């Protein structure tokens, strides 16, 4: 009576790796053995089942060898990776009604077939593509469905999504209210609040699946001053100036990252040099800096090795996250973590999950989204004594360890799911 | 800037009539001319448009002469009735994804085509089958969509039935809830206290997106006339009622999946009620209730396709103890309102289940008897009606009649909807 | 490279048994050991996988014990039964687009999961509910899909629902498009019909021909003692030569033709129609009296009593007079149970009926008029006892040769294995 | 009994114009008055109704002034233009199941709403997106459906593309093929020899359900006028053409996931064609063609959003050796007919892929050069054009122009459609 399975239903991560869902799957597999050991102590024998839509080898980001490494990793542990029919051509990984409906039907199939051979199943489904899985299983699965707890995560349609997304998320919201076995896995304090209010999700049906980073990954290593300086040598940084760093996607219609707010505020920050690394070159930001006579360094297509060096440089005053609400950005967590010994302190807008990340001012600086507010937040960082920066840097590093550690947060999900199984049963 | 159209998207009401939606269409057509006069005082020239799915002549409740009268009534006033494609047989006024999707698309079409030839449109869509209309119009209709205020109304997917709503119902009502919070031009018309609280608590719809469309009856309709004792006995003489016993009356659409009208509860309770004769009038014959009555050895009069003249007489007869309404989760049933009103002088008192809108109708017990949905509770409710003091029987009858006048008057409630829609339109401009 | 699986995708037959698909599943499992033996000698180790939509225990025909038996039968043989999500409540076993789409998606999933652990798969899918399975596997399954041969069987739309038309049009497209997609025809009639109606290439038509399990006890030869014992309660006249018909009542757009025999009996002195319908038929009563025809009209009769009727030396013929049906097995049953005595078969010239009676060599073909029926009966009466011997033997041999379930499921397996080799 | 409507259900042609369907709508409207006169002689009074899916102003090819012109053109003749709900954003004239199902439902609605006010309707539906309209009308429309003859036409799901048609395309065209066989009132309008043979061989459609709707051009349109050498040079002068080299011209909608126009095949072949300059004018700019030309070091001139005046000049210039049409499976392309006609005096000869309707257009080699769809064959085809004797070049140019006159004249071919539909209408009655 102790065979426990986690079924991870993910739109990418094995055959294809091209975004945040795939990173989640990879950190998951790195944590599998530790999670197995942890749950053995609670008396469960854990296996992992991974479900991913069939991809065509010509899909963007397809990697036959990554698929093979995933399959071997899970098989070596008595788990399995299963490619799922999605009534599609295999080139995308997203779609409309037909894609969502078929992939949810076969994701549900995988859950029930896993329930057939196990004693208990935690089905962790992600995105609108799998949002119908809980209702399909719980409506039709009979005694097998009563072995399953669903945790559906990674976004509910927010108030323009497609009709397919609206309907699928409306379906999972219905089933979360309807069934004791359907929970929403919230990725942040912000989405837990949003979904309770927006979808009338009951508190008892909200379960933590909180976004985090894998703190021990090599890409987060602390760098020496010597290595920092040789990595940033080709970035064209000025010999003088305190850097305030931002990076990410270019601002877009409906996606204001707020880079312009730093450039505007830098007008009133003598000795501050904005350093902004966008996905692609940004002529608009160049024209804005030239108009304001602000000496910004504007980079593009920078690798994280180089952002980390920038963030760690003693010349770097802060890292700024000034964008509109996002539910689960991990970039500010990466900044607080790689700067654990030197460099940036974090300035965060009061939107989305950012206040939670900087602990509402205890591990970083919160600002409203205006140039004057951002200017005042920058000089609040400059005003800190060396000792005060040391305390806030330590607080930010501790906050990542305490709240945004991937190993702890997936353990938190598993414990909550196992606890909820017992309570429902 | 004066041509205002109400577009009513209704799953029945002209070719087909079986339940409350069709009664609603009859009610608004009877009130249309008065509504036109009233809205003209508020500065609008009002036209009515009715969209109903094409039906096959084999459909239950089909009457092509009713379709003729409705189409001609509307045409004589410059309005129109329009039969709507729903990608189906036409043999049923419900369906799944294909039915909902095609009907919402063509209902959306009718809205936008009306918007193109008018200055403003109030699009009143009813039930999950049309719940996607607001989103289809507002997503794709461009400038024509900006002339429309949506009011989506009537029954919806809920957590209050043992039968789980279909995926199509769940998706559609999720879609319209999304659009109430996404669009200034998408409101829901609550038909009852029960649906209003459901919109806020289940669907998280903001209070500003709620508009009144409260279930009600046309009190002055001749079919609600008080009857003489002679005319009562005349009408019930051909119903096969036993010479002895007191009647508990029920009527309505047959129970079906997703629609538990609770007739079986009265039959069950009647084997503990020795002098009680259930009288159950369903739209269609119902062999299933006959098997239940037989199985229980319950003497019950099971009727079908009864005209309201005969139901009214049954409700007013001194031989009738009660009329019972035992639906699992009525969103906004008007039949208990009809009983309270037609019995204002004599006859039945109302027994109502403690679910859906029924407690609001009987004023939580001041205007009728509230019962849990079990055979033992229903039997105890019949006994409660029997044991009332004379003063309490008179008081409850008067209170029920007064509640219909104050809360469930169709002329008042449809004017409330229309005044709220005209105000909301002014707000969004 | 020797692991072969047959994946049978069926809307019923384990959790639920109500119609012909369930009977097919039951006869197939009885034949599994023989098929395994037969295919082992062709170099294949054979596993059976059964996929059926999840049913609720309240579904009509639900039997938890039949489900357990099928489960044990397949597990004992290294196979499995798999219940399939169909995005439905589990009460029906049929539905619309949502049901067809989900059930085909998970049917396709079961095929591909089977292909992952085997070397070759024959995916036998049935009815419009699984008709999208070949397309979903072959469009998206990659290298796993190239291990699969699809045989889609049990009906193409020939007024069906939009969902049936679309699903069957999809599989027709895929049968033309893909070397790995075949249509399993159940009769000579449907093989011709699908070639003409759906432009199915000849190389994509594969036999899955309807048949009966000849050796089932329900087809046992009865002594005259047992025959007379079983028909004693049927209210048969002391005199008269019977012409027997049985099956469903005639319904709108599905005329079984019972009235044609009653009308023809007006011109058949000494012939007594015996008609056993599913439910009582007051219309047939009204019509027998109108014509002063002495008919025996029965309802709800078990095959034990039908078989006794068909075997009685008093029975002249069994008649099958309805409009086109693609794969009726009732006339095969009549030809088989009368192999030693009783009825010879009269068949309308519709659907699979001419094939069944070998176009007159194993029975009497008739046009669907009362005069033709009466004439057909006269021809049966005219036959000498030696000609009746000839035709009864031809009819029994025809069932053994063409309508034997064990042979026809072997014929399917051999055709699919040959097709597999040819595609590689 | 004289009121006849043609309902044209078109995925583009008013709000949006990019390809052949929109060109057909334009040709049709210009020919409307002559069709009305001609059908008046056969006893019918004819109205045109146009249905096109709602588009957002951001859709490619959108022009609000074109929409207004079409709407006024039809209104002035007592007809109408109707934008149709398709349950989509309006950013694209295609989609999957949702788009197909909603647009077919509202197309069917427009057909039936037209049948209610007319005596007879010819419903011309185009492409897979409307292929379910005949079945939707005929299944559910009752007496109104009995006034309609359906003619379904244009591109469809085939086995002739490397990209497999989508499930929605396969289902919809399977559905119209079924209804063609099931209903006397459902025909398909073949636009080419290729689609006629495909209807019969792929979809088993009976020959009596096929009516002609053969792709054609309005030869007398001013845009097909012969140009002087001076006017040719003035129009080509602003296109950035190199001083030296002979041109091979292509133009059309950009290639897209289910639409391989073969532009890349010409750029490929040009690596083996030292004196040849490809000139490719796509509706939209096309970064990918520039990357391919750069990768191949081919000095192609890549144009976008060119007016037909300038394409005509390119095609007539003696510097132009050929116009190439290299689509994978054109159901009925008219662009080769435009080249054959406008170059009747000078300029291009036509190179046509050996697939789709293209071999029929060039009379299997008598009116142009047929090529297999490979780079090596396309380059061979260009060389074959160069090596023609003077007599054969002259003869081919004349044969090409004569073929358009004889087989691809729009005024004759749209009259042929209308006469065949009117004949078919009489037979079903
Ligand atoms: N005359 C008659 N009217 C009926 C019958 N069944 C239902 N109705 C009417 O149909 C309407 C039912 O509406 P409601 O009580 O709101 O329930 P709904 O049918 O579930 O919407 C009422 O006006 C009933 O009086 C019947 O058998 N005979
Ligand atoms: N002026 C102009 N017309 C174009 C362009 N691209 C396509 N067309 C016209 O659009 C129509 C294309 O129709 P056709 O050749 O049948 O191909 P389809 O687009 O695949 O239907 C023809 O009339 C073309 O001349 C362009 O870039 N400029
Ligand atoms: C099918 N259904 C969901 C059970 C509803 C549909 C409906 C009809 N009237 C109203 S309100 N809703 C019903 O019939 O009550
Ligand atoms: C999307 N599609 C199937 C590739 C077609 C649709 C179409 C547009 N015009 C015609 S004809 N068919 C196309 O764009 O050519």
Q: According to the annotation, is D258 in a ligand binding site?
A: no
Which atom of ligand 1 lies closest to the CA of B217?
Answer: 23
Specify the DSSP class assigned to residue B351.
E
Specify the DSSP class assigned to residue A105.
H
Q: What angle do CA B253, B257, B258 make, to 5 degrees?
A: 85
CA dist B362 and B353 (Å) reads 10
Pairing mode, if any, of strands D246-252 and B210-212? unpaired
Burial of residue B261 (number of CB atoms within 10 Å: 0-12, 13-18, 19+):
buried
Residue in the block written with tokens 């006469």: D419
Beta bridge partners of A122: A6, A149
Backbone angles phi, psi at D9, to 5 degrees: -100, 105
A30 min Cα distance to partner chain C (Å): 25
CA C191, C197, C202, C203: dihedral to nearest 10 degrees?
A: -100
Q: Are A137 and A174 members of one domain?
A: yes
Q: Are A100 and A190 members of one domain?
A: yes
Cβ neighbour number for residue B198 with a 10 Å cutoff: 21
CA dist A58 and A43 (Å) reads 43
Neighbour-count burial for A278-307, b at 16+ CB within 10 Å, e otherwise: beeebeebeebbeebebebbbbeebeeebb
Cβ neighbour number for residue C368 with a 10 Å cutoff: 15
Cα dihedral across residues C370, C371, C375, C378: positive or negative: positive
Q: Are C36 and C178 members of one domain?
A: yes
Q: Taking the CA of residue A214 as centre, how many other CA atoms within 13 Å lie in the half-sphere pointing to its CB?
A: 14
Nearest to C197 by CA among C181, C175, C219: C175
Q: Are B283 and B197 members of one domain?
A: no
Nearest to A340 by CA among A393, A408, A263: A393
Decide: helix, strand or coil at residue D285.
coil
- Among all residues of chain A, which has the CA nearest to that of D95? A96
CA dist A263 and A375 (Å) reads 10
Interface test with C, best of B94, B98, B162 (most C CBs within 10 A): B98
Q: What are the DSSP E strand ranges found in C199-286?
A: 205-207, 241-247, 271-277
CA dist B265 and B379 (Å) reads 9
Residue in the block written with tokens 């009639």: C189
- Among all residues of chain B, which has the CA nearest to that of A170? B174
- Does residue A154 come out as left (phi exceeding 0), alpha (psi in the -120 to 50 range) or beta? left
Q: Taking the CA of residue B364 as centre, how many other CA atoms within 13 Å lie in the half-sphere pointing to its CB?
A: 2
Backbone angles phi, psi at C152, to 5 degrees: -100, 130
CA dist C337 and A364 (Å) reads 89
Cα dihedral across residues C58, C60, C63, C67: positive or negative: negative
- After which residues is chain A discontinuous, taking C to N > 2.5 Å? 159
C1 min Cα distance to partner chain D (Å): 31
CA dist D135 and D132 (Å) reads 6
Q: How far is CA B334 from the centre of its chain?
A: 6
Cα dihedral across residues C224, C227, C232, C236: positive or negative: negative
Beta bridge partners of A9: A51, A125
Tokens of D81: 């233009």
The radius of gyration of chain A from alpha carbons, rounded to an integer in Å, stands at 23
CA dist A74 and A51 (Å) reads 12
Taking a C-beta distance cutoff of 8 angstroms, is the pair D358, D333 a contact? Answer: yes
Q: Are C120 and C169 members of one domain?
A: yes
Beta bridge partners of D279: D249, D301
Cβ neighbour number for residue B296 with a 10 Å cutoff: 16
Give CA separation, C104 vs A137, A206, C183, C184, in Å: 16, 33, 16, 17
Nearest to B220 by CA among B342, B311, B347: B342
CA dist C348 and A208 (Å) reads 69
Backbone angles phi, psi at B269, to 5 degrees: -65, -25
Decide: helix, strand or coil at residue B309.
helix
Tokens of A420: 């909820």
Strands of the sheet with A45-53, listed across from one edge: A80-84, A45-53, A3-9, A120-126, A148-153, A182-186, A206-208
Q: Are B141 and B56 members of one domain?
A: yes
- How many domains in chain D? 2
C70 in B contact zone (CB under 8 Å): no
CA dist C277 and C301 (Å) reads 8
Backbone angles phi, psi at D415, to 5 degrees: -65, -40
Residue in the block written with tokens 């149709």: D84
Nearest to A207 by CA among A4, A7, A416, A35: A416
Q: Are C346 and C409 members of one domain?
A: no
CA dist D153 and D191 (Å) reads 7
CA dist D235 and B265 (Å) reads 86
Taking a C-beta distance cutoff of 8 angstroms, is the pair D165, C174 a contact? Answer: no
CA dist D369 and D354 (Å) reads 9
Method: X-ray
Collect all residues of chain D within an 8 Å Cβ-Cβ radius of residue B86.
105, 140
Collect all residues of chain B within an 8 Å Cβ-Cβ radius of residue A139.
164
Give CA separation, D358 vs A32, B233, D127, D191, D193, in Å: 59, 84, 19, 12, 10
- Among all residues of chain C, which has the CA nearest to that of A132? C87
Q: What angle do CA A260, A262, A266 make, to 5 degrees?
A: 120
User: Which resolution in angstroms does this entry have?
Assistant: 2.1
CA dist A357 and A196 (Å) reads 20
Backbone angles phi, psi at B267, to 5 degrees: -55, -45
Ligand 1 pocket member B11 (CB < 6 A)? no
Which atom of ligand 2 lies closest to the CA of D327?
Answer: 20
Nearest to B332 by CA among B352, B351, B360: B360
Which atom of ligand 1 lies closest to the CA of B282?
Answer: 27
Chains that touch D (3 or more CB pairs under 8 A): A, B, C
Q: Are D250 and D209 members of one domain?
A: no
Point out the residue among D165, D174, D181 whose CB comes nearest to the CB of C166. D174
Beta bridge partners of A244: A274, A318
Widest distance between CA atoms in chain D: 67
Using H for helix, E for strand and C for coil, what is the string for B229-282? HHHHHHHHHHHCCCCCCEEEEEEECCCECCECCCHHHHHHHHCCCCCEEEEEEE
Q: Taking the CA of residue C363 as centre, how many other CA atoms within 13 Å lie in the half-sphere pointing to its CB?
A: 33
Pairing mode, if any, of strands B80-84 and B45-53? parallel
Tokens of D50: 């146009």
Strands of the sheet with C148-153, listed across from one edge: C80-84, C45-53, C3-9, C120-126, C148-153, C181-185, C205-207
CA dist B274 and A122 (Å) reads 54
Taking a C-beta distance cutoff of 8 angstroms, is the pair C319, C373 a contact? Answer: yes
Taking a C-beta distance cutoff of 8 angstroms, is the pair A320, A374 a contact? Answer: yes
Q: What angle do CA D147, D152, D153 make, to 5 degrees?
A: 145
Neighbour-count burial for B95-118, b at 16+ CB within 10 Å, e otherwise: bbbbbbbbbbbbbbbbbbbbbbeb
Cα D305 to ligand 2 centre (Å): 11
Cβ neighbour number for residue C302 with a 10 Å cutoff: 11
Taking a C-beta distance cutoff of 8 angstroms, is the pair D362, D335 a contact? Answer: no
Backbone angles phi, psi at B226, to 5 degrees: -65, 140
CA dist A1 and B273 (Å) reads 51
Q: What angle do CA D131, D135, D139 make, to 5 degrees?
A: 165
Q: What angle do CA D370, D372, D374 make, to 5 degrees?
A: 135
Q: Are B93 and B184 members of one domain?
A: yes
Point out the residue among D87, D164, D168 whose CB comes nearest to the CB of A163. D87
Decide: helix, strand or coil at residue D93.
coil
Tokens of A139: 């409506």
Tokens of A406: 């991937």
Nearest to C120 by CA among C29, C206, C37, C6: C6
Cα dihedral across residues A305, A306, A309, A310: positive or negative: negative
Q: How far is CA C216 from the centre of its chain?
A: 16
Tokens of D390: 């003077």
Q: Are B384 and B413 members of one domain?
A: no
- Does residue D262 come out as left (phi exceeding 0), alpha (psi in the -120 to 50 range) or beta? left
Cα dihedral across residues B165, B166, B172, B174: positive or negative: positive
Taking a C-beta distance cutoff of 8 angstroms, is the pair D249, D279 a contact? Answer: yes
CA dist C340 and C37 (Å) reads 32
Q: Are C320 and C363 members of one domain?
A: yes
Tokens of C354: 């001419």
Burial of residue A31 (number of CB atoms within 10 Å: 0-12, 13-18, 19+):
buried
Backbone angles phi, psi at D378, to 5 degrees: -60, -40
Q: Are A195 and A298 members of one domain?
A: no
Cβ neighbour number for residue B278 with a 10 Å cutoff: 24
Burial of residue B418 (number of CB atoms within 10 Å: 0-12, 13-18, 19+):
buried
D395-398: long-range contacts (C-beta < 8 A, 24 or more apart)? D396/D349, D396/D366, D396/D367, D396/D368, D397/D343, D397/D344, D397/D349, D398/D344
Q: What angle do CA B320, B321, B326 make, to 5 degrees?
A: 105
Q: How far is CA C110 from the centre of its chain?
A: 25
Nearest to C116 by CA among C139, C145, C137: C145
Q: Concatenated DSSP letters for D195-259? A: HHHHHHHTT---GGGEEE----B-TTSGGG----HHHHHHHHGGG---SSSEEEEEEESPPBTTB
B98 in C contact zone (CB under 8 Å): yes
- After which residues is chain C discontinuous, taking C to N > 2.5 Å? 158
Taking a C-beta distance cutoff of 8 angstroms, is the pair B148, A144 a contact? Answer: no
Angle between helices D20-30 and D64-76 (to 10 degrees): 30
Q: What CATH number corresponds to the domain at position C21? A: 3.40.50.2000
CB-based contacts of A70, cutoff 8 Å, min separation 6: A13, A14, A25, A29, A50, A81
Cα D71 to ligand 4 centre (Å): 24
CA dist C155 and C351 (Å) reads 13
Tokens of A154: 């990674």
Q: How far is CA A417 from the centre of its chain?
A: 20
Nearest to B226 by CA among B128, B347, B330: B347
Give CA separation, C281 vs A162, C328, C394, D401, in Å: 54, 22, 34, 72
CA dist A326 and D73 (Å) reads 49
Using H for helix, E for strand and C for coil, what is the string for chain A? CCEEEEEEECCCCCCECCCHHHHHHHHHHHCHHHHHHHHHHCCCEEEEEEEEECCCCCCCCECHHHHHHHHHHHHCCCCEEEEECCCCCCCCCCCCHHHHHHHHHHHHHHHHHHHHHCCEEEEEEECHHHCCHHHHHHHHCHHHHCCEEEEEECCCCCCCCCHHHHHHHHHHHHHHHHCCCEEEEECCHHHHHHHHHHHCCCHHHEEECCCCECCCCHHHCCCCHHHHHHHHHHHCCCCCCEEEEEEECCCECCECCCHHHHHHHHCCCCCEEEEEEECCCCHHHHHHHHHHCCCCEEEECCCHHHHHHHHHCCCEEEEEECCCCCCCCCHHHHHHHHCCCCCCEEEEECCCCHHHHCHHHCCCEEECCCHHHHHHHHHHHHHCCHHHHHHHHHHHHHHHHHHCEHHHHHHHHHHHHHHHHHHHC
Nearest to C144 by CA among C123, C160, C163, C125: C123
Collect all residues of chain D within an 8 Å Cβ-Cβ radius of residue C169.
170-171, 173-175, 177-178
Taking a C-beta distance cutoff of 8 angstroms, is the pair C423, C145 a contact? Answer: no
Specify the DSSP class assigned to residue C235.
-
Nearest to B111 by CA among B103, B127, B122: B122
The radius of gyration of chain C from alpha carbons, rounded to an integer in Å, stands at 23
Say whether A159 and B171 touch across the interface (CB within 8 A): no
Taking a C-beta distance cutoff of 8 angstroms, is the pair C103, C129 a contact? Answer: yes
Tokens of C278: 């599913």
Nearest to A338 by CA among A256, A230, A245, A248: A245
Nearest to A358 by CA among A188, A229, A220: A188
Ligand 4 site-directed mutation target among D11, D52, D94, most atoms within 8 Å of CB: D94
Tokens of B47: 């036209």
CA dist C148 and D15 (Å) reads 47
Domain span at B342: 222-407
Specify the DSSP class assigned to residue A213.
B
Give CA separation, A234 vs A229, A310, C317, in Å: 9, 12, 99
């Amino acid at each position: 009576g102790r065979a426990l399975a986690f079924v991870w239903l993910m739109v990418e991560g094995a055959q294809v790796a091209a975004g945040g869902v795939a990173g989640y799957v990879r950190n998951l597999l790195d944590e599998q053995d530790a999670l197995r050991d942890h749950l053995a102590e609670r008396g469960w024998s854990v296996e992992f089942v991974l479900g991913e839509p069939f991809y065509d080898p010509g899909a963007p980001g397809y990697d036959e060898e990554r698929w093979r490494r995933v399959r071997e990793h899970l098989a070596a542990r008595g788990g399995r990776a299963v490619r799922l029919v999605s009534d599609s051509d295999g080139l995308d990984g997203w779609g409309e009604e037909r894609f969502f409906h078929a992939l949810s039907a076969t994701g549900a199939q995988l859950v029930l077939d896993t329930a057939e051979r196990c004693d208990a199943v935690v089905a962790v489904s992600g995105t609108s593509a799998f949002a119908r899985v809980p209702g399909m299983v719980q409506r039709q699965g009979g005694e097998l469905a009563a072995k399953v707890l669903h945790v559906h995560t990674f976004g509910l349609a927010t108030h323009v999504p497609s009709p397919a997304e609206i309907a699928a998320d409306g379906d999972v919201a219905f089933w979360t209210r309807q069934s004791d076995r359907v929970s929403v896995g919230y990725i942040s304090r912000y989405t837990a609040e949003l979904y309770a209010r927006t979808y009338a999700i009951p508190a008892a049906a909200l379960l933590p699946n909180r976004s985090a980073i894998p703190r021990h990954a090599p890409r987060f290593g602390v760098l020496t001053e010597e290595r920092i300086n040789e990595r940033i040598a080709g970035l064209g940084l000025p010999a003088e100036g305190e850097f305030v760093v931002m990076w990410g996607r270019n601002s877009a219609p409906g996606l204001d990252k707020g880079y312009h707010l730093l450039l505007e505020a830098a007008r009133d920050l003598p000795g501050v040099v904005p350093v902004i690394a966008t996905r692609r070159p940004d002529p608009g930001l160049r024209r804005l800096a030239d108009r304001y006579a602000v000496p910004a360094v504007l980079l593009d297509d920078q690798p994280f090795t180089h952002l980390s060096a920038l963030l760690q440089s003693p010349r770097t005053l802060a890292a700024a996250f000034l964008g509109e609400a996002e539910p689960g950005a991990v970039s500010p967590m990466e900044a607080m973590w790689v700067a654990r010994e030197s460099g940036a302190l974090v300035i965060a807008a009061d939107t989305g999950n950012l206040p939670e990340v900087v602990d509402d001012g205890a591990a970083g600086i919160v600002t409203r989204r205006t140039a004057a507010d951002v200017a005042d937040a920058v000089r609040r960082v400059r005003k800190l004594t060396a000792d005060e920066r040391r305390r806030m840097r330590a607080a930010a590093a501790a906050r990542v360890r305490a709240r945004f550690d991937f190993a702890a947060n997936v353990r938190e999900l598993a414990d909550a799911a196992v606890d909820r199984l017992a309570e429902v049963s």
